[PDB]
Design a protein around this nucleic acid. Structure first.
Lengths: 211, 129, 102, 82, 98, 59, 152, 111
RNA sequence: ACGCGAAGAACCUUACCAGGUCUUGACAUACUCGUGCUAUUCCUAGAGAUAGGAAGUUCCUUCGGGACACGGGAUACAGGU
RNA sequence: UCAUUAAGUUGGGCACUCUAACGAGACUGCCGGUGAUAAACCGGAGGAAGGUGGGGAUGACGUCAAAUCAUCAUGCCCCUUAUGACCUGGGCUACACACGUGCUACAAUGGAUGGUACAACGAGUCGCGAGACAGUGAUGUUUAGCUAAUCUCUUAAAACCAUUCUCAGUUCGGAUUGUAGGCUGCAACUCGCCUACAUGAAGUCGGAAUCGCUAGUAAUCGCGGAUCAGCACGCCGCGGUG
């Protein structure tokens, strides 16, 4: 067994991705907006997913979005998330909201580093030098405690290989874990690849106290 | 009646809003007897170490207001509510409050139980199959 | 002795070599005092016997000890693993009898 | 009970065989059947799932459902019981 | 008789700082019974910590409810002109009643 | 089977006596919070993340 | 375990003035039924109150003399050579074991009420003979076999 | 007669002195405890002199104790083969609730 | 390992089987077409399915029709819990 | 507290419940015997709390190839007339028999006699659902209130005195049963109950043994969720006694 850091942060120790309240249909709009978030992450299929926080509001919805860069994802000039935003209006039928914000430096994101290097694992990269390469890029770019994780499954193999350069002070048992973390399965004919990226630039993360 | 002395002590999901009358030692709990609210249960005589036997003695008509708890709950509210209430009428009983305690309202209780466990300290049984 | 629980947990049960189980645990009933409970729990699979798993657990009245061990043949697992139960009781002589060590 | 409950299509075979002829079996379905006093003296089938059981009725058959007309709850039965 | 619940699943996020956009209704108004921390209403979840087999342990999630009221007897409908603005968060369980 | 056990209860059956509800990711059987319209087991798959004011560390 | 981890204390009686009133509640009291327990204890000094009508401590303390032995036993081995080398523990534990004795014979007798078979053993405790003095001499006669201390 | 004159105990109320009897009990034996006006009564080793003579036919409302025997008998022994989905289970011997007979109900089920 | 998945499957819910039980597949993304508002509601029989009929479908934009794709000819393969 | 009586409920009294939104509140903090010198220990006072006040969490390098092919999938297999389905009820829970398995008893602390006082107690004016009621109760008859710090829940039990059965297979002990009714739903046997009632079996304290229990800890008593039309001793948490 291993504890998930974001699995004990992002609910209440870090504030919600569904960062809004309701009265009765809280899990209704919450869960169906999570299906909408699935539609975002699957209809950025010619883009780069970074983070999204769809919201319900006083105007019964405010969709909070994030991109990995505005210059390529949001459109030719910004009309892919806008025309696809009106496509979400013809999905769920509501006032529908764009939020063009780049998640800053996505070489310090666990999504684009690990998922990008996992797409290059689909392109058959030497995974050890991929580990040293990517975690050297972000550890080079700060990341006070930074590691990752890759599973095995090479054309009828065992569960998981080792994980070189899985380093960095990540005191996951302790209650100071400010980690952009991710995980991934790469489904191939030869098997699947789990990619789990611990990024620890910030030190502290309770987000639960307010006067 | 007259205005309170703010006797704010309790224990174990009880409330002892102890009405505090400078009197003779008369005990009347919610206009009643606590042997009429929870008969009886010698905790009536474990009002004395909260109030009467405290320093031998403290003599005031405490018209005690309580609810919640029970023969140890609101008798702990007798302890902190009426010992601390005795401190509210007369603050010269900390010789007894740090001769014997009668404070902290410790609220020792049962754990934040692990789901799956019955009493968090007991299983069904096991022999060895 | 008192009670068994014979369990072939992948293949059906056949009481020739299960009777051979019953006779070598008959020699457990040469090394018994109260054969309180045992349980056979065996496992054989596909691909021309790339394993032979067997098991019997031993809740006697004071000690408990199971045996999930292997050979290539299931017959050889009954052989060498119940002989391993014999040599386990050979390990359990002083571990049983010599409650004085001096 | 108050607000009673009863068959529908083989109620229309109570009313399609009470008037016409008291003879035939039915591809029945009923966890929802009864028996009326008029119903006594005829033959009906019981849907176990393979054998539409051809039982005539006697007045003893009080208004139960075809889930318990005859014990078609197949359990063999005469092997090791009691 | 304007009375404001900030009913919150937890008041102790930025919806505690939602007490100031209704303090825009405390100003341009008088006789303010201010922040009333209401008795929290709790909620229970118990779920299998594993997926399908080997249930040694479970998990619990106590969704509580930390609420809020301000009680002003006078409406003073320039504070109804302040009723149009309501900033943080996107959606909170706010009640602004008479 | 994912469609006779997801799509089938989406299709109108007789009653609540027949079409028992569940979450809409995978039609998992009961132990389903109908007060929050989602399965325990499938809502746990969210509770990897969790969008709930409940304390996350298994109280 | 390792330490002298702390015990707990119940309060002594103001009614009949013994801590073994409420410790007699600590053995007769089952399922936490302290009011019924005090009904039996106060009913037992009521059993004194019919028989003698004296102080509770005559029958209760002569009973304590009957049920507080001098010696108790202990298993101490060489390598199996279990010399039952004895000890003589203090009156809180000796009084505790005597409370096990009066809850034993004043519990397990097939008579009418708890105060009736406990009238048999509190009233026969007022007869101060038989089961209690034998219930300590059963260990007292063993001490000559418990003569060895750490010898071999 | 005799019904009330059958097998007198002492020491009791008539209600337990009639649940004591095969039949008349806590509804009806308390009903005729009051209808004969008995009320504990006895604990006496005397019933009455003449509340017997009330409670002959005042007691005789149950039809009958011997036809409780013939009411179980007359009921079920006609009620043999309605199915016999219930009669076979009742008289083979399992408690025919439609009851889960896997392990337990061990005494009536038969070990 | 057994108050176990399954903290409620009256039952089609069910996994799996019996029977009625079909084979563009109930659920299907898929090439193509005479071309469209799919209506609901029914009625008949039948255990209901599932079939027959009634109005239930003959284009919402520069008009193919997108739009309800209508129902089909069919690569395509979802649908094994 | 101006109370000033349906009444905590009021034109009102306001921290009183402290209500929970906040800070400060116990850190060897201080002291003595100390410790090689230190880390620490032993204790004392203070300190509401004293030595990480207490309780959850925090599963590590790694192990068990075990579980997840019924979330999640590739290797190949049946994937297209089939292990893919619509309907229908019967199985899925069936019982010669072992352990998993709690409650109930055997009894006088029980069992009747009554009237308590309590934390809980969360969903909800979607539904809970009054002192309006036929009642034996299911449920109606009314649904009052009910967007909950309203309301029906939420008035839980033991301790309380009242009488007896004070001795026994026992006002027993509750195995059924036969019913005679209601609730749920389209339908209560498979494959829910519940309310009677009548009969009311074992059972008279439990082999070998096992397991748990050093604080509100065992023991114990209740509440709700829990699933859900219906349906929960053990099934989550909370506390009432101790």
């Amino acid at each position: 067994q291993k504890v998930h850091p974001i699995g004990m942060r992002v609910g209440v120790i870090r504030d919600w991705d569904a960062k809004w309240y309701a009265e009765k249909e809280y899990a209704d709009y919450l869960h169906e907006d999570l299906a909408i978030r699935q539609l975002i992450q699957t209809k950025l299929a010619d883009a780069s997913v970074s983070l999204i926080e769809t919201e319900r509001a006083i105007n019964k919805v405010i969709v909070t979005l994030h991109t990995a860069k505005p210059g390529m994802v949001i459109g030719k000039s910004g009309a892919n998330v806008d025309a696809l935003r009106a496509e979400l209006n013809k999905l769920t039928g509501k006032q529908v909201h764009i939020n063009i914000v780049e998640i800053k430096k996505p070489d310090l994101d666990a999504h684009l580093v690990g998922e990008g290097i996992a797409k290059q694992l689909e392109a058959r990269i030497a995974f050890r030098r991929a580990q040293k390469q990517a975690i050297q890029r972000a550890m080079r770019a700060g990341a006070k405690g930074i590691k990752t994780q890759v599973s095995g499954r090479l054309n009828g193999a065992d569960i998981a290989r080792a994980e070189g350069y899985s380093e960095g002070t990540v005191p996951l048992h302790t209650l100071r874990a400010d980690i952009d973390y991710a995980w991934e399965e790469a489904d191939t004919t030869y098997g699947k690849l789990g990619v789990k990226v611990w990024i620890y630039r910030g030190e502290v993360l309770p987000t639960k106290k307010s006067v | 009646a007259q205005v309170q002395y703010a006797g704010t002590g309790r224990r174990k999901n009880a409330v002892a809003r102890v009405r505090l009358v400078p009197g003779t030692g008369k005990i009347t709990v919610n206009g009643r007897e606590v042997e009429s609210y929870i008969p009886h249960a010698d905790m009536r005589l474990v009002i004395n170490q909260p109030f009467a036997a405290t320093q031998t003695e403290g003599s005031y008509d405490t018209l005690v207001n309580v609810n919640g708890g029970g023969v140890s709950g609101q008798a702990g509210a007798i302890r902190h509510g009426i010992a601390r209430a005795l401190l509210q009428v007369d603050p010269d009983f900390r010789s007894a409050l740090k001769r014997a305690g009668l404070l902290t309202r410790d609220a020792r209780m049962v754990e934040r139980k692990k789901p799956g466990l019955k009493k968090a300290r007991k299983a069904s049984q096991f022999s060895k199959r | 002795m008192i009670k068994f629980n014979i369990r072939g947990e992948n293949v059906e049960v056949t009481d020739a070599i299960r009777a051979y189980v019953e006779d070598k645990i008959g020699k457990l009933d040469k090394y018994f005092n109260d054969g309180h409970e045992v349980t056979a729990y065996v496992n054989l699979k596909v691909y021309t016997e790339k394993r032979a798993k067997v098991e019997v657990t031993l809740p006697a009245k004071n000690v408990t000890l199971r045996a999930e061990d292997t050979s290539q043949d299931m017959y050889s697992s009954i052989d060498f693993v119940e002989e391993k139960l014999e040599r386990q009781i050979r390990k359990y002589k002083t571990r049983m009898n010599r409650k004085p060590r001096n | 009970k108050k607000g009673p409950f009863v068959d529908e299509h083989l109620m229309k075979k109570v009313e399609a065989q009470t008037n016409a002829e008291r003879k035939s079996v039915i591809k029945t379905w009923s966890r929802r059947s009864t028996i009326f006093p008029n119903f006594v003296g005829l033959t009906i089938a019981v849907y176990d799932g393979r054998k539409h059981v051809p039982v005539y009725v006697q007045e003893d058959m009080v208004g139960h459902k075809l889930g318990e007309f005859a014990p078609t709850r197949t359990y063999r039965g005469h092997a090791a019981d009691d | 008789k304007i009375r404001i619940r900030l009913k919150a699943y937890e008041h102790r996020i930025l919806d505690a700082a939602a007490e100031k956009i209704v303090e825009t209704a405390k100003r341009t108004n008088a006789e303010v019974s201010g922040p009333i921390p209401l008795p929290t209403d709790r909620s229970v979840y118990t779920v299998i910590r594993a997926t399908h087999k080997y249930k040694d342990s479970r998990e619990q999630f106590e969704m509580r409810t930390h609420k809020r009221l301000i009680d002003i007897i006078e409406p003073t409908q320039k504070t109804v002109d302040s009723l149009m603005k309501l900033d943080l968060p996107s959606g909170v369980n706010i009640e602004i009643k008479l | 089977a994912k469609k006779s056990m997801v799509v089938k209860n989406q299709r109108p059956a007789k009653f609540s006596t027949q079409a028992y509800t569940r979450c809409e990711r995978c039609g998992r059987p009961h132990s389903v919070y109908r007060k929050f319209k989602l399965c325990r087991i499938c809502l746990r798959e969210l509770a990897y993340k969790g969008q709930l004011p409940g304390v996350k560390k298994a109280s | 375990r390792k330490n002298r981890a702390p015990k707990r204390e119940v309060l002594a009686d103001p009614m009949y003035n013994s801590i073994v009133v409420t410790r007699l509640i600590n053995r007769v009291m089952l399922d936490g039924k302290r009011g019924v327990a005090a009904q039996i204890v106060y009913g037992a000094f009521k059993q004194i109150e019919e028989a003698t009508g004296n102080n509770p401590l005559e029958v209760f303390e002569t009973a304590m003399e009957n049920i507080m032995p001098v010696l108790e036993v202990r298993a101490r081995r060489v390598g199996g050579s279990n010399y039952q080398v004895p000890v003589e523990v203090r009156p809180e534990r000796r009084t505790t074991l005597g409370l096990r004795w009066l809850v034993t014979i004043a519990r397990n007798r097939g008579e009418h009420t708890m105060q009736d078979r406990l009238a048999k053993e509190i009233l026969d405790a007022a007869n101060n003979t038989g089961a209690a003095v034998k219930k300590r001499e059963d260990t007292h006669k063993m001490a000559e076999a418990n003569r060895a201390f750490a010898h071999f | 007669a005799r019904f009330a004159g059958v097998d007198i105990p002492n020491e009791k109320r008539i209600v337990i002195s009639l649940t004591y009897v095969f039949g008349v009990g806590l509804q009806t034996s308390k009903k005729v405890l009051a209808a004969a006006g008995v009320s504990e009564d006895i604990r006496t080793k005397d019933l009455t002199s003449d509340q017997e003579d009330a409670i002959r036919r005042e007691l005789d409302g149950l039809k009958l104790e011997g036809d409780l025997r013939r009411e179980v008998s007359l009921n079920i022994k006609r009620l043999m083969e309605i199915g016999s989905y219930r009669g076979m289970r009742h008289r083979r011997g399992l408690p025919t609730r439609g009851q889960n007979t896997k392990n337990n109900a061990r005494t009536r089920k038969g070990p």
